[PDB]
Design an enzyme around this catalytic site. Structure first.
Site, PDB file in Angstrom:
ATOM      1  N   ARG B  12       0.830  -1.206   0.000  1.00 60.39           N
ATOM      2  CA  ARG B  12       0.000   0.000   0.000  1.00 60.39           C
ATOM      3  C   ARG B  12       0.868   1.261   0.000  1.00 60.39           C
ATOM      4  O   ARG B  12       0.701   2.147  -0.851  1.00 60.39           O
ATOM      5  CB  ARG B  12      -0.949  -0.023   1.196  1.00 60.39           C
ATOM      6  CG  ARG B  12      -1.959  -1.188   1.118  1.00 60.39           C
ATOM      7  CD  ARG B  12      -2.994  -1.165   2.246  1.00 60.39           C
ATOM      8  NE  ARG B  12      -2.415  -1.669   3.485  1.00 60.39           N
ATOM      9  CZ  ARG B  12      -2.274  -2.954   3.785  1.00 60.39           C
ATOM     10  NH1 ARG B  12      -2.724  -3.907   2.982  1.00 60.39           N
ATOM     11  NH2 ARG B  12      -1.665  -3.293   4.919  1.00 60.39           N
ATOM     12  N   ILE B  13       1.811   1.350   0.945  1.00 57.95           N
ATOM     13  CA  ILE B  13       2.694   2.516   1.055  1.00 57.95           C
ATOM     14  C   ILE B  13       3.705   2.568  -0.095  1.00 57.95           C
ATOM     15  O   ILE B  13       3.945   3.619  -0.690  1.00 57.95           O
ATOM     16  CB  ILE B  13       3.432   2.502   2.419  1.00 57.95           C
ATOM     17  CG1 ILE B  13       2.444   2.541   3.576  1.00 57.95           C
ATOM     18  CG2 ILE B  13       4.469   3.646   2.469  1.00 57.95           C
ATOM     19  CD1 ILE B  13       1.589   3.760   3.625  1.00 57.95           C
ATOM     20  N   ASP B  34       9.474  -7.101  -4.470  1.00 57.72           N
ATOM     21  CA  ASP B  34       8.304  -7.549  -3.735  1.00 57.72           C
ATOM     22  C   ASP B  34       8.114  -9.026  -4.031  1.00 57.72           C
ATOM     23  O   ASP B  34       8.559  -9.514  -5.068  1.00 57.72           O
ATOM     24  CB  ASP B  34       7.069  -6.725  -4.139  1.00 57.72           C
ATOM     25  CG  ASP B  34       5.933  -6.851  -3.139  1.00 57.72           C
ATOM     26  OD1 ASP B  34       5.297  -7.927  -3.128  1.00 57.72           O
ATOM     27  OD2 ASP B  34       5.698  -5.903  -2.343  1.00 57.72           O
ATOM     28  N   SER B 120       9.897   3.028   6.417  1.00 57.98           N
ATOM     29  CA  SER B 120       8.570   3.663   6.387  1.00 57.98           C
ATOM     30  C   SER B 120       7.771   3.334   7.645  1.00 57.98           C
ATOM     31  O   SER B 120       6.578   3.049   7.618  1.00 57.98           O
ATOM     32  CB  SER B 120       7.803   3.231   5.128  1.00 57.98           C
ATOM     33  OG  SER B 120       7.384   1.865   5.218  1.00 57.98           O
ATOM     34  N   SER B 150       5.889   7.055  12.421  1.00 55.43           N
ATOM     35  CA  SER B 150       4.609   6.396  12.153  1.00 55.43           C
ATOM     36  C   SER B 150       3.604   7.428  11.670  1.00 55.43           C
ATOM     37  O   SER B 150       3.823   8.625  11.832  1.00 55.43           O
ATOM     38  CB  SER B 150       4.050   5.735  13.421  1.00 55.43           C
ATOM     39  OG  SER B 150       3.760   6.786  14.350  1.00 55.43           O
ATOM     40  N   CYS B 151       2.460   6.962  11.142  1.00 54.94           N
ATOM     41  CA  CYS B 151       1.419   7.919  10.774  1.00 54.94           C
ATOM     42  C   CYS B 151       1.001   8.753  11.983  1.00 54.94           C
ATOM     43  O   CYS B 151       0.908   9.985  11.878  1.00 54.94           O
ATOM     44  CB  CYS B 151       0.234   7.207  10.117  1.00 54.94           C
ATOM     45  SG  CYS B 151      -0.271   5.652  10.841  1.00 54.94           S
ATOM     46  N   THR B 152       0.798   8.125  13.146  1.00 58.15           N
ATOM     47  CA  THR B 152       0.336   8.881  14.296  1.00 58.15           C
ATOM     48  C   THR B 152       1.356   9.926  14.714  1.00 58.15           C
ATOM     49  O   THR B 152       0.997  11.064  15.025  1.00 58.15           O
ATOM     50  CB  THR B 152       0.008   7.932  15.453  1.00 58.15           C
ATOM     51  OG1 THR B 152      -0.987   7.001  15.003  1.00 58.15           O
ATOM     52  CG2 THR B 152      -0.494   8.713  16.651  1.00 58.15           C
ATOM     53  N   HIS B 178      -8.010   5.350  15.212  1.00 59.46           N
ATOM     54  CA  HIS B 178      -7.270   4.857  14.061  1.00 59.46           C
ATOM     55  C   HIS B 178      -8.217   4.064  13.177  1.00 59.46           C
ATOM     56  O   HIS B 178      -8.672   2.974  13.537  1.00 59.46           O
ATOM     57  CB  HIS B 178      -6.067   4.019  14.522  1.00 59.46           C
ATOM     58  CG  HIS B 178      -4.957   3.965  13.521  1.00 59.46           C
ATOM     59  ND1 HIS B 178      -3.912   4.867  13.519  1.00 59.46           N
ATOM     60  CD2 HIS B 178      -4.738   3.133  12.473  1.00 59.46           C
ATOM     61  CE1 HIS B 178      -3.094   4.595  12.512  1.00 59.46           C
ATOM     62  NE2 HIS B 178      -3.577   3.551  11.857  1.00 59.46           N
ATOM     63  N   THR B 192       0.304   2.231  21.607  1.00 55.26           N
ATOM     64  CA  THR B 192       1.073   2.884  20.565  1.00 55.26           C
ATOM     65  C   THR B 192       2.302   3.549  21.180  1.00 55.26           C
ATOM     66  O   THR B 192       2.245   4.077  22.299  1.00 55.26           O
ATOM     67  CB  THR B 192       0.253   3.940  19.816  1.00 55.26           C
ATOM     68  OG1 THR B 192       1.125   4.728  18.998  1.00 55.26           O
ATOM     69  CG2 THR B 192      -0.487   4.856  20.777  1.00 55.26           C
ATOM     70  N   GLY B 193       3.411   3.500  20.453  1.00 50.07           N
ATOM     71  CA  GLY B 193       4.614   4.220  20.829  1.00 50.07           C
ATOM     72  C   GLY B 193       4.661   5.667  20.394  1.00 50.07           C
ATOM     73  O   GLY B 193       5.663   6.345  20.632  1.00 50.07           O
TER      74      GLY B 193
HETATM   75  N1  LIG Z   1      -1.586   2.760   7.128  1.00 52.66           N
HETATM   76  C1  LIG Z   1      -0.681   1.992   6.554  1.00 52.66           C
HETATM   77  O1  LIG Z   1      -0.940   1.046   5.818  1.00 52.66           O
HETATM   78  C2  LIG Z   1       0.750   2.354   6.921  1.00 52.66           C
HETATM   79  C3  LIG Z   1       1.012   3.682   7.256  1.00 52.66           C
HETATM   80  C4  LIG Z   1       2.299   4.068   7.621  1.00 52.66           C
HETATM   81  C5  LIG Z   1       3.295   3.129   7.658  1.00 52.66           C
HETATM   82  N2  LIG Z   1       3.030   1.845   7.338  1.00 52.66           N
HETATM   83  C6  LIG Z   1       4.205   0.939   7.423  1.00 52.66           C
HETATM   84  O2  LIG Z   1       4.782   0.721   6.195  1.00 52.66           O
HETATM   85  C7  LIG Z   1       5.163  -0.652   6.041  1.00 52.66           C
HETATM   86  C8  LIG Z   1       4.313  -1.287   4.956  1.00 52.66           C
HETATM   87  O3  LIG Z   1       2.940  -1.312   5.310  1.00 52.66           O
HETATM   88  P1  LIG Z   1       1.868  -1.598   4.122  1.00 52.66           P
HETATM   89  O4  LIG Z   1       0.524  -1.144   4.613  1.00 52.66           O
HETATM   90  O5  LIG Z   1       2.331  -1.069   2.787  1.00 52.66           O
HETATM   91  O6  LIG Z   1       1.975  -3.215   4.145  1.00 52.66           O
HETATM   92  P2  LIG Z   1       1.502  -4.173   2.904  1.00 52.66           P
HETATM   93  O7  LIG Z   1       1.411  -5.537   3.539  1.00 52.66           O
HETATM   94  O8  LIG Z   1       0.492  -3.463   2.112  1.00 52.66           O
HETATM   95  O9  LIG Z   1       2.858  -4.148   1.980  1.00 52.66           O
HETATM   96  C9  LIG Z   1       3.944  -4.948   2.348  1.00 52.66           C
HETATM   97  C10 LIG Z   1       4.586  -5.458   1.032  1.00 52.66           C
HETATM   98  O10 LIG Z   1       5.855  -6.005   1.325  1.00 52.66           O
HETATM   99  C11 LIG Z   1       6.036  -7.185   0.574  1.00 52.66           C
HETATM  100  N3  LIG Z   1       7.032  -7.926   1.268  1.00 52.66           N
HETATM  101  C12 LIG Z   1       6.907  -8.545   2.489  1.00 52.66           C
HETATM  102  N4  LIG Z   1       8.000  -9.118   2.892  1.00 52.66           N
HETATM  103  C13 LIG Z   1       8.918  -8.861   1.889  1.00 52.66           C
HETATM  104  C14 LIG Z   1      10.268  -9.203   1.716  1.00 52.66           C
HETATM  105  N5  LIG Z   1      10.936  -9.926   2.607  1.00 52.66           N
HETATM  106  N6  LIG Z   1      10.891  -8.796   0.584  1.00 52.66           N
HETATM  107  C15 LIG Z   1      10.197  -8.069  -0.283  1.00 52.66           C
HETATM  108  N7  LIG Z   1       8.925  -7.706  -0.240  1.00 52.66           N
HETATM  109  C16 LIG Z   1       8.344  -8.115   0.884  1.00 52.66           C
HETATM  110  C17 LIG Z   1       4.654  -7.812   0.478  1.00 52.66           C
HETATM  111  O11 LIG Z   1       4.485  -8.631  -0.637  1.00 52.66           O
HETATM  112  C18 LIG Z   1       3.778  -6.565   0.359  1.00 52.66           C
HETATM  113  O12 LIG Z   1       3.560  -6.249  -1.006  1.00 52.66           O
HETATM  114  C19 LIG Z   1       4.975  -1.245   7.431  1.00 52.66           C
HETATM  115  O13 LIG Z   1       6.154  -1.055   8.206  1.00 52.66           O
HETATM  116  C20 LIG Z   1       3.832  -0.412   8.032  1.00 52.66           C
HETATM  117  O14 LIG Z   1       3.854  -0.361   9.436  1.00 52.66           O
HETATM  118  C21 LIG Z   1       1.796   1.441   6.964  1.00 52.66           C
END
Ligand SMILES: NC(=O)c1ccc[n+]([C@@H]2O[C@H](COP(=O)([O-])OP(=O)(O)OC[C@H]3O[C@@H](n4cnc5c(N)ncnc54)[C@H](O)[C@@H]3O)[C@@H](O)[C@H]2O)c1
Ligand SMILES: NC(=O)c1ccc[n+]([C@@H]2O[C@H](COP(=O)([O-])OP(=O)(O)OC[C@H]3O[C@@H](n4cnc5c(N)ncnc54)[C@H](O)[C@@H]3O)[C@@H](O)[C@H]2O)c1
Lengths: 315, 314
Positions: B12-13, B34, B120, B150-152, B178, B192-193
């Protein structure tokens, strides 16, 4: 034995009948609703969230028979035209949402009932009662009383312990309400008067609390958070112990890691969540957070019926 | 000179970060890695559930994803050490897998040949935590691994920085609502931290804030409430005036009556909601509530890219 009529046999009115059926010295003689008896019976007996009615209930001509006793069913939108006097009704439980002040609720008294309990805040010439906090303000000479709001019933026992055992300097409330057209899909900030109004229930806290609400578009347990400054030092352990020592059929105590669906069906007005208590101490200054849960339907209804039963004992 | 970025974890990010980086000059994404099949990744890049359609072209060539007529190499190796970052001349990796969120794990990217990593997410306390618009000035360019928090934390930090600077903060308690395992149909209290991390981003607030989260099972905008005791008297108008004075691309100011769907898609890291400010005065003692909104995906991603660009220019 006290005869009750339920005006508005909706979500609250039906659950109130389930609870009154558990009591002696009081019985529902009649219900009034704009909805036909056939559908009201089905909604009373069967409920996906609060479960099946634990008793018997059947339909007759112009009546429902609950646990072997006939309860008359009426469908008259105008309360002044109900036969409360002819039936000897002592107390009307006003649960329609349309007659929530004294002058509107007294239509029931003009129809021959002696007293009215409103299932909502009732205005300033109407005593406001949270059972377990201030029912002793009732002496039986009142004609119309109020059992307050769901938020007030959640907040008041928590605030009462803080005030009695520590002293409250001031505090700000945030209630998360699990439920205009926006509210179906959005988190929506909303005004509430519950914290500002808390002096109706706990006079010592008049002018000391305010707060507001975040309406979240999911039907589940709700919660009220209070962030306060207290008059003496406090630990998380001391606050939690005080809440447990105050626990009762009206005020529950929780130390499990729970989620909102775990709250559904509680009969407490308020369920103190000890796992969420926090005390921040910085240079001797302390800031305290306390959280209690409530089931918007069942928590309020059980408080309403407790208040009704207590009132009924004073006449 | 142009900066080459690789995105590790095209989730997603990672996907929204590519969307944003395509809008910037002087920087470009050279590669993504990925484990998900590339076919599913193209579809989710073009169609996001909350942020809508990607504003450009994307197609799957051999070994590459072509985005706005430019090929980005695609890899699938769960082990960063083995990725060809050096061969490709990668300057900075955006680490977005969720699984390499500390220094020892992230430095595999450096071994593979990248010069720098931005995680991230919180990356542990031995990795500098940056909220752009609050403390990017702690970076000197000699760091190899940093965190964009973090987002927060990105939502709370600009609000808290203004309170600290204009009034001084004694202490405060945060509640974050959240939007999003049980969190899919329940309200779930959660630790949460973030409020502690504020004591890193803003060192004067170290030890002074804590808080918690209420996870609500609705995909919409999120918000963060802070209840604080301040060192100087304050009014609702003065607090709101100070937040507006401090607004920026990172910190928005709102005065209208808004709801959580109004926040979806914002590019601020934080949107201060002046309508929710409350100062209660009792016997001369003041307690203050301030609230800011954020989009957990889009607010954070725009902050992540801001931090990446600043770090890469040092
Ligand atoms: N609201 C949110 O979704 C959000 C907001 C801020 C930060 N984050 C942080 O950003 C990071 C990603 O979150 P996300 O929501 O995008 O997660 P997600 O599960 O949507 O994306 C994770 C991606 O990583 C890939 N992946 C996993 N292990 C892997 C590896 N070993 N090698 C390569 N690719 C790998 C997966 O296939 C997946 O496509 C996390 O640390 C999360 O805490 C998320
Ligand atoms: N969470 C809750 O549902 C909740 C909690 C606390 C208090 N309350 C209060 O209780 C009251 C009712 O709420 P509810 O959820 O049961 O609403 P509801 O809509 O389920 O029930 C209201 C009932 O009143 C009937 N009715 C309406 N006008 C009438 C009239 N003039 N004469 C007779 N019947 C009439 C309707 O047919 C309906 O059955 C309101 O005051 C509400 O604020 C509700």
């Amino acid at each position: 034995s006290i005869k009750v009529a339920i005006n508005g046999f909706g979500r609250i009115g039906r659950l109130a009948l389930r609870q009154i059926e558990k009591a002696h010295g009081i019985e529902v003689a009649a219900v009034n609703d704009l909805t036909p008896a056939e559908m009201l019976l089905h909604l009373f007996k069967y409920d996906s969230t609060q479960g099946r009615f634990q008793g018997t209930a059947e339909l007759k001509d112009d009546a429902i028979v609950v646990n072997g006793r006939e309860i008359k069913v009426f469908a008259n939108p105008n309360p002044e035209e109900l036969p409360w006097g002819e039936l000897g009704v002592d107390v009307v439980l006003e649960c329609t949402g349309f007659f929530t002040n004294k002058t509107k609720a007294e239509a029931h008294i003009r129809a021959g009932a002696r007293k009215v309990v409103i299932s909502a805040p009732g205005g300033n010439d109407v005593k406001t009662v949270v059972y377990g906090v201030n029912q002793d303000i009732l002496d039986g000479s009142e004609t119309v009383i109020s059992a307050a709001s769901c938020t007030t019933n959640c907040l008041a026992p928590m605030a009462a312990v803080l005030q009695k055992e520590f002293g409250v300097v001031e505090g700000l409330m945030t209630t998360i309400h699990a439920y205009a057209r926006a509210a179906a899909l959005n988190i929506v900030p909303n005004s509430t008067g519950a914290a500002k109004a808390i002096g109706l229930v706990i006079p010592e806290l008049n002018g000391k609390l305010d707060g507001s609400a975040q309406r979240v578009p999911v039907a589940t347990g709700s919660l009220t958070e209070l962030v306060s400054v207290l008059e003496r030092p406090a630990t998380k352990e001391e606050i939690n112990a005080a809440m447990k020592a105050a626990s009762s059929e009206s005020y529950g105590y929780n130390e499990d890691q729970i989620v909102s669906s775990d709250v559904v069906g509680i009969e407490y007005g308020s369920l103190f969540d000890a796992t969420q208590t926090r005390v921040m101490t910085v240079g001797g200054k302390q800031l305290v957070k306390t959280v209690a849960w409530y089931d918007n339907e069942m928590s309020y209804t059980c408080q309403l019926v407790r208040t009704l039963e207590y009132f009924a004992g004073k006449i």
